[PDB]
Tab-separated table of C-alpha atoms and ligand atoms in Angstrom:
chain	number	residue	atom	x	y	z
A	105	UNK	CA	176.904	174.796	158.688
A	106	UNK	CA	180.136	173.227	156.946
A	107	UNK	CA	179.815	169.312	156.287
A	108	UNK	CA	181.322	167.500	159.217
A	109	UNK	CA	180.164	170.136	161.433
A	110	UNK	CA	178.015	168.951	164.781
A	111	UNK	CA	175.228	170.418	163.619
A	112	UNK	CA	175.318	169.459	159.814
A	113	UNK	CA	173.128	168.589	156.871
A	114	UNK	CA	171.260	164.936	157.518
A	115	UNK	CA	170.712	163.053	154.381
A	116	UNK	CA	167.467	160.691	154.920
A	117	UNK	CA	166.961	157.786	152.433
A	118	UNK	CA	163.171	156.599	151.108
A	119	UNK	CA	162.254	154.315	148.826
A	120	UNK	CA	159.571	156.460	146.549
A	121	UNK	CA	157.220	152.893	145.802
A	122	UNK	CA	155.523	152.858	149.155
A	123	UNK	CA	152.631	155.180	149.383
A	124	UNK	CA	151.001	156.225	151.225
A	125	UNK	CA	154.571	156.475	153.492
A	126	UNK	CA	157.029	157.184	150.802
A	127	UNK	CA	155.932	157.772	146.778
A	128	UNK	CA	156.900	160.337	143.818
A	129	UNK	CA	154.194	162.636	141.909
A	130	UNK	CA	153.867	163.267	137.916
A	131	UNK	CA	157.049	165.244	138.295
A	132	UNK	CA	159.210	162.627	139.759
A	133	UNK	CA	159.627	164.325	142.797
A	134	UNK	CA	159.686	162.208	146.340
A	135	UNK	CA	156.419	162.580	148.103
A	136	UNK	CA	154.633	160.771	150.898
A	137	UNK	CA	154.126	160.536	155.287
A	138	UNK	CA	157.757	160.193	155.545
A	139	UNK	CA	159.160	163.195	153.773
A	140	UNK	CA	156.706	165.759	155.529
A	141	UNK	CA	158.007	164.179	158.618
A	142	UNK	CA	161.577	163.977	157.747
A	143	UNK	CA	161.492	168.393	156.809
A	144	UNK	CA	159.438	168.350	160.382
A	145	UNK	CA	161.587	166.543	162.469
A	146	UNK	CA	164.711	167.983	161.260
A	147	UNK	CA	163.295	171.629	161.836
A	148	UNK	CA	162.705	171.130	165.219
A	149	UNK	CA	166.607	169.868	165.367
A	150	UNK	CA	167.626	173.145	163.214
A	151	UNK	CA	169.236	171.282	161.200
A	152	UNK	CA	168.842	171.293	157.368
A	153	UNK	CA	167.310	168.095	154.876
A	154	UNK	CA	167.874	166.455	151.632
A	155	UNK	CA	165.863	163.263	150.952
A	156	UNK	CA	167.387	160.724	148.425
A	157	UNK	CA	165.917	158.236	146.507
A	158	UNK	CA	167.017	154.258	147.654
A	159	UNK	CA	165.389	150.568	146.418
A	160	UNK	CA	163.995	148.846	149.388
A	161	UNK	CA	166.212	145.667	148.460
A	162	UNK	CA	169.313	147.524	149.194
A	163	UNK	CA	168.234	149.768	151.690
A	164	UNK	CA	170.229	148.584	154.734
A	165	UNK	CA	173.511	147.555	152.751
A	166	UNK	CA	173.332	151.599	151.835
A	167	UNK	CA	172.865	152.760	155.159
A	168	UNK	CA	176.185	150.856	156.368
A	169	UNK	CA	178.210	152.236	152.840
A	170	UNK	CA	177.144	155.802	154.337
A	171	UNK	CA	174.724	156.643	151.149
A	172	UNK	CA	172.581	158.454	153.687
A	173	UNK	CA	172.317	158.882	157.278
A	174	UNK	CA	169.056	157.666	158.162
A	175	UNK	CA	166.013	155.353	156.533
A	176	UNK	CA	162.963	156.503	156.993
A	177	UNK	CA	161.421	154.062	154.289
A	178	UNK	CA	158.232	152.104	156.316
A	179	UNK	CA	160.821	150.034	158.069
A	180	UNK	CA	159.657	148.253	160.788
A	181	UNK	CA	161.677	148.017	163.982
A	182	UNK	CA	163.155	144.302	164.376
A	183	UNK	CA	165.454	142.699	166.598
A	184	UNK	CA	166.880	140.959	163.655
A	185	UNK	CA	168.104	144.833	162.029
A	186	UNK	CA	168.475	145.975	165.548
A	187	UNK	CA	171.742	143.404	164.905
A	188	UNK	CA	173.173	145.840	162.142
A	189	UNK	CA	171.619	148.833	162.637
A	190	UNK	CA	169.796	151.200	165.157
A	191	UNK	CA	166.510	152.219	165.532
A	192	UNK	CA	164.681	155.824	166.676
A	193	UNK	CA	161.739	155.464	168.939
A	194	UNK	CA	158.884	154.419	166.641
A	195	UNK	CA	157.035	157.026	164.997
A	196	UNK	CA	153.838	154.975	163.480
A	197	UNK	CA	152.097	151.633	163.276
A	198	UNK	CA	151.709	149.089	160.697
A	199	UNK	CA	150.144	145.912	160.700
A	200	UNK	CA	150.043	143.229	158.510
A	201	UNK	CA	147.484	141.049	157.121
A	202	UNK	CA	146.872	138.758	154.286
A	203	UNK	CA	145.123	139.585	151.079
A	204	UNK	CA	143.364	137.278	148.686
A	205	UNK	CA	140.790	138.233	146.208
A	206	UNK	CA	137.128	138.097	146.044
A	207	UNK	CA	135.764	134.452	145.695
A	208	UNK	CA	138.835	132.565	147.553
A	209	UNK	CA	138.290	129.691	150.251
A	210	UNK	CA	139.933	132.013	152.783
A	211	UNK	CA	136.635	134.563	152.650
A	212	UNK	CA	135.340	131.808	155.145
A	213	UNK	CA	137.726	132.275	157.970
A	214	UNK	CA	137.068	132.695	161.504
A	215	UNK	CA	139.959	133.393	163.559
A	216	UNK	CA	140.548	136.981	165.493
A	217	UNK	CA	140.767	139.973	164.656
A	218	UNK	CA	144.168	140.646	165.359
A	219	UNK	CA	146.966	138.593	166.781
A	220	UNK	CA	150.594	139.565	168.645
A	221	UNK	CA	153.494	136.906	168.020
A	222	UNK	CA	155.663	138.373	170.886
A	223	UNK	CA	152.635	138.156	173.334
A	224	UNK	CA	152.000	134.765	172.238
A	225	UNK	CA	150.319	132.050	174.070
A	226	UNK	CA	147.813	129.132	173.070
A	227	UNK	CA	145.078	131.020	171.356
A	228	UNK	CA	147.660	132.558	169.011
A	229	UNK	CA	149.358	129.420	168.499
A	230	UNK	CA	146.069	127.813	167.361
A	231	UNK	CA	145.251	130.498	165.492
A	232	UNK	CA	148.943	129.921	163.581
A	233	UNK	CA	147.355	126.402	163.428
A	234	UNK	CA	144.567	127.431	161.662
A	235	UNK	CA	146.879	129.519	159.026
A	236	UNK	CA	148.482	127.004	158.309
A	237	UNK	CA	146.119	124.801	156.855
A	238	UNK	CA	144.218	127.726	154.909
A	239	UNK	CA	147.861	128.049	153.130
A	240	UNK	CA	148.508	124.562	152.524
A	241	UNK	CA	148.282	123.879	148.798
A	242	UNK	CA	147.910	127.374	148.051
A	243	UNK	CA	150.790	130.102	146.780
A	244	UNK	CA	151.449	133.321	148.894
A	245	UNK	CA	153.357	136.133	147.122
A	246	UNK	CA	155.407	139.098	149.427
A	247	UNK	CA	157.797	142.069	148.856
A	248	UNK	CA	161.619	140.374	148.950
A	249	UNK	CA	163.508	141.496	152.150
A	250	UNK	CA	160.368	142.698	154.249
A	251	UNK	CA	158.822	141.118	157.686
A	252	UNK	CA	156.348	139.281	155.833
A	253	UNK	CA	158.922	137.178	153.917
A	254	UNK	CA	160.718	136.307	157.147
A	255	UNK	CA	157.677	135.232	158.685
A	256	UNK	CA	156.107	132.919	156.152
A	257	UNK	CA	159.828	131.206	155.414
A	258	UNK	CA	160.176	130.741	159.579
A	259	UNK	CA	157.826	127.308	159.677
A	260	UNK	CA	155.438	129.306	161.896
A	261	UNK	CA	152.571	128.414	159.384
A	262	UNK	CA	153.972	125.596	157.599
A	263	UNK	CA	155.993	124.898	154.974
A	264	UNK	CA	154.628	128.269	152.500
A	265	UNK	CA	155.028	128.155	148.478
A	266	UNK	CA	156.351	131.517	148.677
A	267	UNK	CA	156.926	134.176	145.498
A	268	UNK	CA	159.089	136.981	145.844
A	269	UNK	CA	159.181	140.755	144.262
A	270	UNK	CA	161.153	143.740	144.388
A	271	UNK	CA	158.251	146.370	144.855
A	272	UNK	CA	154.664	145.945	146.523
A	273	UNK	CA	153.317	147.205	142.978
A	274	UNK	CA	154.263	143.912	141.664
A	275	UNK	CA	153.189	142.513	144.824
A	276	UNK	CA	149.705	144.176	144.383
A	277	UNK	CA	149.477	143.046	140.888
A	278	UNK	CA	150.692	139.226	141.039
A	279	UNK	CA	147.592	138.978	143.439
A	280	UNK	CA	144.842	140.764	141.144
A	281	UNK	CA	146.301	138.727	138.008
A	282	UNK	CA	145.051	135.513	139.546
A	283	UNK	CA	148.767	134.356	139.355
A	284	UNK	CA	149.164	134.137	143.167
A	285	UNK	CA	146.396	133.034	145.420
A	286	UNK	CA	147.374	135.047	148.409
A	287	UNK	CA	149.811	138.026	149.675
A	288	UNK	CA	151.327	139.143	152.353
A	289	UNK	CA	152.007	143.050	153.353
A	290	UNK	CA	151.000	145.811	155.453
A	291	UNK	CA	147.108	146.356	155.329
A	292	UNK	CA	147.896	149.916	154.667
A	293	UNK	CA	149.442	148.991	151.431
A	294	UNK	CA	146.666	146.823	150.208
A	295	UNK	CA	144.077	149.430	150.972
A	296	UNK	CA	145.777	152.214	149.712
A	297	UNK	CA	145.903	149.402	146.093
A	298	UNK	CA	142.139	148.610	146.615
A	299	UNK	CA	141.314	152.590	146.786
A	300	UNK	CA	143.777	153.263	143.470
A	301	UNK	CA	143.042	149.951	141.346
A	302	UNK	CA	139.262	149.217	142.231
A	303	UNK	CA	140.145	145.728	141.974
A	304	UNK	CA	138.407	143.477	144.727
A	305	UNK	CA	141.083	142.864	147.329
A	306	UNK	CA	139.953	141.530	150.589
A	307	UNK	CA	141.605	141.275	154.093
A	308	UNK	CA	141.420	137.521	155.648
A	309	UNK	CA	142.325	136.466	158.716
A	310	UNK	CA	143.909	138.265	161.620
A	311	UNK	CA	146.092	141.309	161.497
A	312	UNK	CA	149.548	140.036	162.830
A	313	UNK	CA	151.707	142.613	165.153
A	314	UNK	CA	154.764	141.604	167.162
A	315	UNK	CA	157.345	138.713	166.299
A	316	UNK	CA	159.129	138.849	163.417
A	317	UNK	CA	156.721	142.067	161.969
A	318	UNK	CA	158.415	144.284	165.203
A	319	UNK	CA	157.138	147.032	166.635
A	320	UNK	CA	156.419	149.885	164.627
A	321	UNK	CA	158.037	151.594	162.258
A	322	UNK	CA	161.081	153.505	163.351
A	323	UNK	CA	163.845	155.916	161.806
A	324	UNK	CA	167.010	153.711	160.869
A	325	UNK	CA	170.402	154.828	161.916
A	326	UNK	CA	174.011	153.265	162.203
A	327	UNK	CA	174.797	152.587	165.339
A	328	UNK	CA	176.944	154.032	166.935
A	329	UNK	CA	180.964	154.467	167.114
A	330	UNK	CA	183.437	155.806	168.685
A	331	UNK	CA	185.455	156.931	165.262
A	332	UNK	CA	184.061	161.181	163.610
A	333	UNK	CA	181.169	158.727	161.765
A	334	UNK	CA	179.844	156.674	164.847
A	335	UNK	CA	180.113	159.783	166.900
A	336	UNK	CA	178.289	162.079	164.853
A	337	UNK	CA	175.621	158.864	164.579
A	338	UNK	CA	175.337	158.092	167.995
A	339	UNK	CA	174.235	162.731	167.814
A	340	UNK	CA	171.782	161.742	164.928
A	341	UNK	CA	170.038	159.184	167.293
A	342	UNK	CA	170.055	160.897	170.282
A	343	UNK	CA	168.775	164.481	168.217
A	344	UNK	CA	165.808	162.203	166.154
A	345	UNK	CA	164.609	160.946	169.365
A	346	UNK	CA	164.377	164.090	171.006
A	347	UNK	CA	162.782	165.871	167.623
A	348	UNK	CA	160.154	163.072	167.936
A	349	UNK	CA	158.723	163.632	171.437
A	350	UNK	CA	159.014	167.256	170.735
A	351	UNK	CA	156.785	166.334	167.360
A	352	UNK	CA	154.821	164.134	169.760
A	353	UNK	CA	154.053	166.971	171.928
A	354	UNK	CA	152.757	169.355	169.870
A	355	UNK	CA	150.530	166.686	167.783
A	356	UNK	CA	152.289	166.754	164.459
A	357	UNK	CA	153.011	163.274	164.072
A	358	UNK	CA	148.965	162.333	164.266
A	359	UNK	CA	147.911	165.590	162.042
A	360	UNK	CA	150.626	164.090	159.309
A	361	UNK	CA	149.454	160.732	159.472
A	362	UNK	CA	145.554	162.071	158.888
A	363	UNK	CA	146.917	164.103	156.248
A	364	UNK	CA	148.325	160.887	154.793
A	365	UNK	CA	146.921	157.386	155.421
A	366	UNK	CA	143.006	159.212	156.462
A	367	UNK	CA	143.219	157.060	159.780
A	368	UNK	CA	145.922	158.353	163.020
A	369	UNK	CA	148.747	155.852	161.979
A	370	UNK	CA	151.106	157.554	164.552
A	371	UNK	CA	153.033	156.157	167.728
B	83	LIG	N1	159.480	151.007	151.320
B	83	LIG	C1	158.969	149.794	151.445
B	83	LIG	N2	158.597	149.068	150.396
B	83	LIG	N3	158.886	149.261	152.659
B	83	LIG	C2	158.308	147.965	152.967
B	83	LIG	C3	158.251	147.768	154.470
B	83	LIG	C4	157.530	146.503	154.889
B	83	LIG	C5	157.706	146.161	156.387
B	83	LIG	N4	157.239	147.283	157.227
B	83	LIG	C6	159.161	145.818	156.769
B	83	LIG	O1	159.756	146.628	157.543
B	83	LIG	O2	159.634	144.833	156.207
């Protein structure tokens, strides 16, 4: 099928520094959730797959300048990207919690177990409340350009001494150094770290969902246009959405996810 063609090649960026959702083995070679799904989903399209290697911090600025067609990179779906971008139909969850190590004030919480900033309401709003003072004083550390940063520089838990890197590894490390007293990231990520490292990482507080962490994590496309690009991106929506409830259907999404993160991660 000649490049151009309706029925072309699709070019899918991923990070590589994400496991379990996107990583690279001994050889180099991009591994992970996301690139057994990618060769999946674009089977059941019939249409043929390279994956390409991307930094997170430039991810979206790469999508626009047409360095690939779609991100499938742990992206959660926000209404903030939704601005410059398009999202698939989510594939799989992720939530978000806060890590601190073993012997930190924050191993005395009690707050729930999980809390949803679009469903709001007073209990949550306490329970930001309660955040907010367990940070005060303290310095949180996050992956630059992720959910977690725009939710600990909105206000909604104070006024945060927040520390910025470009991968979670450094993320996962600034923590276990002492040098931070508290990050931010998916709970996947952390685990996966605690499994790897066998350094004492511990989940506090409640697992956050909603707001400014979206809903889910979703394929990343430009949206649509009207010019050859937009129209054959406005196909590449319409032909990943349909490849997902086909995937659905026949229960690859949750055997993947197994196969990946141990737990059914899927949407
Ligand atoms: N490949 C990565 N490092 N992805 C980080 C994603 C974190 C979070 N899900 C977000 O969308 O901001």
């Amino acid at each position: 099928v000649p490049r151009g063609s309706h029925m072309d090649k699709i070019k899918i960026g991923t990070e590589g520094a994400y496991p379990p959702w996107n990583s690279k083995d001994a050889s180099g070679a991009l591994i992970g959730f996301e690139v057994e799904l990618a060769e999946e989903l674009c089977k059941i399209m019939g249409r043929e797959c390279t994956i390409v290697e991307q930094d997170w911090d430039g991810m979206i600025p790469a999508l626009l300048m047409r360095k690939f067609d779609a991100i499938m990179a742990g992206m959660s779906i926000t209404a903030e990207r939704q601005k410059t971008i398009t999202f698939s139909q989510g594939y799989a969850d992720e939530v978000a919690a806060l890590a601190v190590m073993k012997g930190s004030s924050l191993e005395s919480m009690d707050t729930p177990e999980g809390i949803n900033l679009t469903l709001g309401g007073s209990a949550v709003k306490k329970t930001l409340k309660t955040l907010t003072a367990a940070l005060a004083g303290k310095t949180v550390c996050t992956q630059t350009g992720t959910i977690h940063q725009n939710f600990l520089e909105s206000g909604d838990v104070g006024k945060v001494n927040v520390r910025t890197y470009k991968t979670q590894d450094e993320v996962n490390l600034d923590l276990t150094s002492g040098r931070c007293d508290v990050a931010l990231a998916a709970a996947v990520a952390f685990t996966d770290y605690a499994d790897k490292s066998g350094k004492p990482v511990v989940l506090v507080g409640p697992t956050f969902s909603g707001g400014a962490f979206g809903n889910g994590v979703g394929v990343g496309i430009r949206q649509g246009g009207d010019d050859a690009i937009g129209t054959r991106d406005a196909k590449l929506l319409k032909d990943f959405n349909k490849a997902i409830n086909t995937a659905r259907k026949q229960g690859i999404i949750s055997k993947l996810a197994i196969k990946h993160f141990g737990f059914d991660a899927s949407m």
